[PDB]
Design a protein around this nucleic acid. Sequence first.
DNA 1: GCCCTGTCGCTGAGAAGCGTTTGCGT
DNA 2: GCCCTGTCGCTGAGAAGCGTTTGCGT
Lengths: 104, 104
Amino acid sequence: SMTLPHIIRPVEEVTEEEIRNICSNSREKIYNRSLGSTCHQCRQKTTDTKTNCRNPDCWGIRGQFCGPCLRNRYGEEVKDALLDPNWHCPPCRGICNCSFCRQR
Amino acid sequence: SMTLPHIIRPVEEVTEEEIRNICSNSREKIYNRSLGSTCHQCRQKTTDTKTNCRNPDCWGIRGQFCGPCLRNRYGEEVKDALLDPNWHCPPCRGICNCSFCRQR
DNA sequence: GCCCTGTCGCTGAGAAGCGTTTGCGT
DNA sequence: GCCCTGTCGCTGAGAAGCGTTTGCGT
Ligand SMILES: [Mg+2]
Ligand SMILES: [Mg+2]
Ligand SMILES: [Mg+2]
Ligand SMILES: [Mg+2]
Ligand SMILES: [Mg+2]
Ligand SMILES: [Mg+2]
Ligand SMILES: [Zn+2]
Ligand SMILES: [Zn+2]
Ligand SMILES: [Zn+2]
Ligand SMILES: [Zn+2]
Ligand SMILES: [Zn+2]
Ligand SMILES: [Zn+2]
């Protein structure tokens, strides 16, 4: 299988450092092929904090969104999403507008 | 990867025995977990001859249909499909009416 | 030029087959 | 009953991240 396992992170396990590491400008991202995480929207693998979809039916990394992409494409803040126990990713809500999902 | 490789069989390599082995009644199928092939429509893995999708963009076993399913669900004969160099499976044509594909 | 500082292309990827499985009531 | 002899449920499955990548011309 090519799919990375999806693990749901509880809201009470979100730390201050992770909140401070949410990207505020896409040009300031730090790339890392091993420790980074890929944002579903912009498809860049970087070390900034990204969202975690808490829908049990979600899979893979489709639920991971960076700071700028979540606010610019959906008007939501990553910090609010990380502290929301019922937050579902735009792919799970069927409203993703990335270049791949809006084709069909 | 869980996907079986898709191999396109040329029309000139279809033999008489394979044509004679096309299923004419679903109750007469012979099941075999190792040598059988799965029909996409009825999801039964049997030894009767099934279609081969010749679209290069096809993948997996979605293009394999048994005799009764092809004629009853799409009005096409497996023998005609096997001898058609440009035959595409109903999933490739977006007209599949199996229980999984017609949901969405 | 303006303010809200932003994004898509490409490769290879995209289940399969078991059990609980065989038409409609027009 | 009829003729054309038929089909769905369930489990686990359903990419990810590289390069060619950063708003519109209203
Ligand atoms: Mg391939
Ligand atoms: Mg069986
Ligand atoms: Mg009815
Ligand atoms: Mg799973
Ligand atoms: Mg790179
Ligand atoms: Mg324009
Ligand atoms: Zn992003
Ligand atoms: Zn999700
Ligand atoms: Zn998307
Ligand atoms: Zn079949
Ligand atoms: Zn096909
Ligand atoms: Zn189908």
